[PDB]
Amino acid sequence: GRCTKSIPPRCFPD
């Protein structure tokens, strides 16, 4: 449950 704000938005399963 975490996403990069810097694009591309890569979201992690946490």
What does this molecule look like?
This protein has strands spanning about 1-5, 10. About 0% of the residues lie in helices and about 30% in strands. By secondary structure, it is mainly beta. Inhibits trypsin, cathepsin G, elastase, chymotrypsin and thrombin. Does not inhibit factor Xa. This is Trypsin inhibitor 1.
Distance between the termini: 4 Å
In order across it, which strands form the biggest sheet?
1-2
**What's the helical proportion of residues?**
under 10%
Shape type: elongated
Largest sheet, in brief, is: 2 strands, antiparallel
Q: Helices and strands, in N-to-C order?
A: EE
The count of strands amounts to 2
Looking at this protein, list some descriptive labels:
elongated; about 30% strand; 2 strands; mainly beta; about 15 residues; about 0% helix
Overview in brief:
The protein is mainly β and 14 residues long. The protein is built from no helices and two strands. It has a two-stranded antiparallel ribbon.
Helix and strand topology:
Layout: E1 2-3, E2 11-12
Antiparallel strand pairs: 1-2
PDB class: biosynthetic protein
Keywords: Inhibitor, biosynthetic protein
Assembly: monomeric
